[PDB]
Design an enzyme around this catalytic site. Structure first.
Site, mmCIF file in Angstrom:
data_model
loop_
_atom_site.group_PDB
_atom_site.id
_atom_site.type_symbol
_atom_site.label_atom_id
_atom_site.label_comp_id
_atom_site.label_asym_id
_atom_site.label_seq_id
_atom_site.Cartn_x
_atom_site.Cartn_y
_atom_site.Cartn_z
ATOM 1 N N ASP A 59 7.615 -2.416 -8.458
ATOM 2 C CA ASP A 59 8.967 -2.827 -8.820
ATOM 3 C C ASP A 59 9.044 -4.066 -9.713
ATOM 4 O O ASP A 59 9.731 -4.068 -10.750
ATOM 5 C CB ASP A 59 9.795 -3.068 -7.555
ATOM 6 C CG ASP A 59 11.204 -3.500 -7.885
ATOM 7 O OD1 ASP A 59 11.959 -2.688 -8.472
ATOM 8 O OD2 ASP A 59 11.539 -4.668 -7.568
ATOM 9 N N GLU A 106 11.320 -14.511 -12.038
ATOM 10 C CA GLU A 106 11.254 -13.117 -11.597
ATOM 11 C C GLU A 106 11.159 -12.180 -12.801
ATOM 12 O O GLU A 106 11.709 -12.478 -13.866
ATOM 13 C CB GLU A 106 12.454 -12.749 -10.703
ATOM 14 C CG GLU A 106 12.447 -11.330 -10.120
ATOM 15 C CD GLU A 106 11.261 -11.006 -9.238
ATOM 16 O OE1 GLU A 106 10.097 -11.326 -9.570
ATOM 17 O OE2 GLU A 106 11.474 -10.377 -8.182
ATOM 18 N N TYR A 115 16.603 -4.176 -1.732
ATOM 19 C CA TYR A 115 17.528 -3.357 -2.515
ATOM 20 C C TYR A 115 18.527 -2.627 -1.595
ATOM 21 O O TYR A 115 18.644 -1.403 -1.625
ATOM 22 C CB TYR A 115 16.745 -2.380 -3.406
ATOM 23 C CG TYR A 115 16.011 -3.107 -4.521
ATOM 24 C CD1 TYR A 115 16.692 -3.541 -5.656
ATOM 25 C CD2 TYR A 115 14.650 -3.388 -4.433
ATOM 26 C CE1 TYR A 115 16.041 -4.238 -6.672
ATOM 27 C CE2 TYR A 115 13.985 -4.087 -5.456
ATOM 28 C CZ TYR A 115 14.688 -4.490 -6.572
ATOM 29 O OH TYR A 115 14.055 -5.166 -7.593
ATOM 30 N N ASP A 117 5.410 -7.624 -7.576
ATOM 31 C CA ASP A 117 4.905 -7.156 -6.294
ATOM 32 C C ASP A 117 4.298 -5.770 -6.434
ATOM 33 O O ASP A 117 4.072 -5.273 -7.534
ATOM 34 C CB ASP A 117 6.042 -7.142 -5.260
ATOM 35 C CG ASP A 117 7.170 -6.194 -5.625
ATOM 36 O OD1 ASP A 117 7.167 -5.707 -6.779
ATOM 37 O OD2 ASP A 117 8.039 -5.917 -4.750
#
Ligand SMILES: [Ca+2]
Ligand SMILES: [Ca+2]
Ligand SMILES: [Ca+2]
Ligand SMILES: [Ca+2]
Ligand SMILES: [Cl-]
Ligand SMILES: [Cl-]
Ligand SMILES: [Cl-]
Ligand SMILES: [Cl-]
Ligand SMILES: [Cl-]
Ligand SMILES: [Cl-]
Ligand SMILES: [Cl-]
Ligand SMILES: [Cl-]
Lengths: 600, 599
Positions: free
Chosen positions: A47, A406, A188, A50
């Protein structure tokens, strides 16, 4: 304003950095190999930085790559990126198909909390943990998988994708519940509910099939969408994103039916995003010009809205609306590429002063489950759009900032579509030799120290290291050699059988043997230290990245001849551990690091 | 009434348990070996349940054993204990002579803090720590050394002891300071000062020589003695003890001179100890009848006063006073032996319900630097007088009670004298085959477990243990063997060289080698695991008492014929560590534990 073709080229390449095993033959990333080969469903994308496969944002991302091709695929052939974009999309779609379990789908691979607790490279994660899978029929996740396959089936002319798009839509539409969607909670979570996914998927199925049942379904979902606060308007004060695609669906339905309700919605939503706002209401803006929706992934949201704004502007005729929405969209993309108070790119490996410390484990290339070591990333995560600056345009490139630095599939997805639009208009030439080879550092090697010296023995502390990264990997048949000159032994009247090898420490769980002292040539002899299962030496944490052995090679107590100063492997050793090229490492019979006596 | 001869026999034997190395050939203690052989001064006694040589209480204890012989040596023939007492005394006196350094003496071996921090057996302490020595000329310590050698010269008819006695007395009397006596601080600090040691030493030198110059010196010291509180009287409200021997010195001077001043002191002091008191003033008494001077070592104090009382009563004529002092003395000795509210002996290995958990490291016999394991002492500290009960007669036998279950040289010393007096009178029979042999445990052995098993290998976890205690000791050339039956291998078509020896863990600091695989006979083969310096396996703590190795014996990967169930050294092994006799242990070539295939 920027080389949008090069930005696009890099932004696509990002997805190859995210590929789970088995990698396709055409993967261009020298520091990625097959990974997570024990997963219940193979392939697809990790994703973010990770190693979880989260199907909701994965499918969302694939759908948006499909949408990019659907709008602009013909318009970008000069960039040379169409075929790259197509096969990257197919890789994800193949995974969504492979997740089918009939009355249900595999919707996640990996446990969020377990995955995130560990910092290290994709290719070695199975040495650290065993990855679960999750099955269910959540309407949001299944509806999104359907949508991705519906658009994919159009742009890739693929009847299998359409078959599965219909399979998944029917399941999602019959289930009408997110109750079986749990494994992604807190990562999510389904926030908006599942009506927007059904809208999005049915709309794409209409565009795929022309079957009016799907248009009727789509139109039936609109009254079920969330309202804006306490009003009767459909919610508009947010972004198209992984959780909620109704925004983009309304734009598609404005184009498809030409109905005024959809046009009213699109203009209200987009106006809210523009500097002029919508009747006194507006998204927050940084002083530097970035529409800033939330603390998390502001660049992701603003660049996705740029794509929607381009698509909507291109689909209408009003000159003032077209200019207003186009200028908004281009302003947000340009901010991401360097039109901001720092004049700096927010896309890794692109433009002026790009981020170099994205929050991305495999691009980092640690060996010991730390973010601070190595202090520089070993790999270039080309094309990754970072989270971005705060509300005041502030930012620092810091691996520890898991918000601003991120990176993720969904961050890049709408961004790709917007870059497609801009390169279509402005052209630009992609980089010819892309990607260029990386500077590597040492992967497998011994660190050694004199543990004790005596007039009758040498004692060595030796650490056989696996700090692999190009790509991170496991070698089973690892060994290294310690070479000596025994001239002084023979001259004193002694023989090889007078020299004793003993062990003073050997690290737990590292099955090891030491050979007898073996003749090389002349008076040169060696011992080989072999780890029978060298895969246990792996870059997964502090204990595992090297195996420690302390060995002693001793002439009889009381003798005065032992001379380590002419021994090949003693050269340069001190009492502190240091890498040494004179204790060469082997994978089977192949030397992989260092030098031997007398050279090649 | 008790068998005082047996109590005496055991009370003397205690000192053999205390001997530092080298032991004399006559040492009777099966669980004592040569210990602390790298000490600056060899021999002498460890003080208590520790391993420090503290010269002040060591010399006091020897002076008291000398005094016992001086008074009662000829009167204890029936007991058979004279020779035992004599040679035990000589052992300590030899140490005192060996401390001579010309202008000073060695007065301590060991650092009290480091010694006391560690719990283990004397014979292995050098593996744990380095023992410093301390040199000085403190008047109290040197003067007590002088006194011990002066009385020893008399009772052992030894001119050398006399020469050293005079030399040490002169050093102490020239120095007149305890400023150089420092290493015993807080253990055996000089509380009373040194004038009492000079009095005690000069008194003994007078009794040894008849030279009235020593009597004159002795009398010259009495005005320098501490006073009782703010009064003009010489201090009397305490016990003769390792810090202060003026009490006994005054009793000796009463008999030697006949002078009224000494008799007045002696009766004032002893009266204060008796239930009738001295003009309304008296030592505290427990309800059970123990004269209880202080929290620490009340039995030591009361039994020492018993010996004083016996000697003084034997020296006077008044039948009423004789009875009063004799009854006091006997009551305290009898309390210690069992005449108390619990009817229990306070002497280890004697009488009814003796203490079994004295605070004594070497009698305990641990391997782990713990007091709680083993939960029972592995050895019997026969004859040790413990600290004893509280002021209310309360007591519990607990190794952690370093007050009530303390044991020491000085605790036994007056006690032996009093027991000499009582066995002289009552004439009991000592135990014939003393000491009886102890039950032993296995000392050097492997504990082993199956660490990992598969179709193609055996992996063993093996701990080679040194839990020695009879006596604790060190063995350098340690090895053990692991035996296998390879019949399944040749029968499937494979050979010995299809078998690889590897290691999966080797404990840090344990230099080890494993031999190649070896044929024994038939299809029986083995490997030998050898520690190059086996002395590093020693009963000094949690890490040291065993060396851990994980070794794997492996056929080629993937095969399925390996069958550990017919291997000799595999017998009985589980996945939990347990002692096994089938991995025998060797010292050099000699088997010291376990069994071999075929026998
Ligand atoms: Ca939703
Ligand atoms: Ca050499
Ligand atoms: Ca004193
Ligand atoms: Ca077998
Ligand atoms: Cl505007
Ligand atoms: Cl670094
Ligand atoms: Cl030599
Ligand atoms: Cl080379
Ligand atoms: Cl001195
Ligand atoms: Cl009385
Ligand atoms: Cl126990
Ligand atoms: Cl046997």
């Amino acid at each position: 304003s920027y080389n949008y073709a090069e930005a696009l080229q890099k932004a696509i390449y990002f997805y190859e950095c995210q590929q789970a095993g088995p990698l396709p033959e055409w993967n261009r990333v020298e520091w990625r190999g097959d990974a997570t080969m024990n997963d219940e469903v193979l392939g697809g994308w990790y994703d973010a930085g990770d190693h979880v496969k989260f199907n909701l944002p994965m499918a969302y991302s694939a759908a948006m790559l499909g949408w990019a091709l659907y709008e602009y695929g013909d318009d970008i052939e000069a960039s040379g990126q169409r075929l790259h974009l197509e096969r990257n999309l197919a890789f994800a779609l193949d995974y969504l198909v492979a997740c089918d379990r009939g009355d249900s789908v595999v919707y996640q691979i990996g446990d969020g909390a377990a995955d995130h607790k560990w910092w290290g490279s994709a290719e070695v994660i199975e040495k650290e943990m065993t990855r679960p899978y999750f099955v269910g029929k959540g309407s949001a996740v299944v509806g999104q998988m359907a949508a991705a396959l519906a658009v994919g089936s159009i742009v890739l002319k693929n009847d299998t994708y359409l078959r599965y798009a219909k399979k998944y839509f029917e399941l999602a539409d019959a289930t009408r519940s997110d109750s079986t969607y749990t494994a992604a909670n807190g990562f999510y979570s389904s926030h908006s509910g599942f009506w927007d996914e059904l809208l999005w998927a049915s709309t794409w199925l209409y565009l795929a099939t022309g079957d009016r049942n799907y248009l009727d379904k789509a139109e039936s979902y609109t009254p079920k969408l969330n309202r804006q606060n306490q009003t009767t308007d459909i919610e508009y004060q947010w972004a198209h994103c992984w959780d909620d695609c109704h925004y983009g669906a309304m734009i598609l339905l404005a184009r498809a039916t030409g109905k005024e309700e959809y046009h009213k919605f699109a203009q209200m939503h987009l106006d809210w995003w523009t500097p002029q706002g919508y009747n006194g209401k507006r998204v927050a803006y940084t002083p530097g010009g970035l529409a800033h929706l939330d603390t998390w992934g502001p660049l992701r949201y603003a660049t996705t809205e740029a794509f929607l704004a381009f698509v909507y502007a291109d689909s209408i005729n009003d000159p003032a609306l077209k200019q207003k929405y186009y200028n908004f969209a281009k302003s947000q993309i340009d901010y991401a590429l360097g039109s901001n108070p720092d004049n700096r790119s927010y896309v890794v490996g692109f433009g002026n002063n790009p981020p170099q410390r994205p929050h991305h484990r495999t691009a980092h290339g640690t060996w010991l489950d730390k973010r601070d070591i190595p202090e520089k990333h070993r790999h270039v995560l080309y094309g990754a759009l970072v989270g971005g600056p705060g509300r005041d345009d502030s930012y620092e490139d810091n691996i520890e900032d898991y918000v601003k630095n991120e990176v993720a599939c969904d961050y890049n997805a709408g961004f790709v579509g917007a870059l497609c639009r801009l390169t279509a208009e402005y052209g630009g030439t992609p980089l010819a030799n892309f990607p260029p080879p990386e500077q590597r550092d040492d992967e497998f090697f011994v660190e050694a120290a004199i543990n004790q010296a005596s007039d009758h023995f040498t004692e060595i502390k030796a650490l056989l290291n696996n700090r692999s990264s190009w790509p991170a990997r496991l070698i089973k048949d690892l060994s290294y050699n310690y070479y000596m000159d025994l001239t002084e032994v023979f001259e004193a009247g002694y023989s090889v059988d007078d020299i004793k090898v003993t062990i003073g420490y050997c690290e737990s769980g590292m099955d090891v043997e030491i050979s007898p002292i073996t003749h090389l040539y002349d008076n040169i002899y060696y011992i080989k230290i072999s780890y029978i299962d060298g895969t246990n030496i792996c870059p997964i944490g502090q204990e595992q990245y090297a195996a420690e052995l302390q060995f002693r090679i001793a002439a009889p107590q009381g003798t005065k001849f032992w001379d380590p100063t002419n021994d090949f492997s003693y050269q340069g050793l001190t009492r502190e551990l240091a890498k040494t090229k004179y204790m060469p490492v082997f994978d089977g019979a192949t030397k992989i690091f260092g030098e031997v006596p007398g050279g090649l």
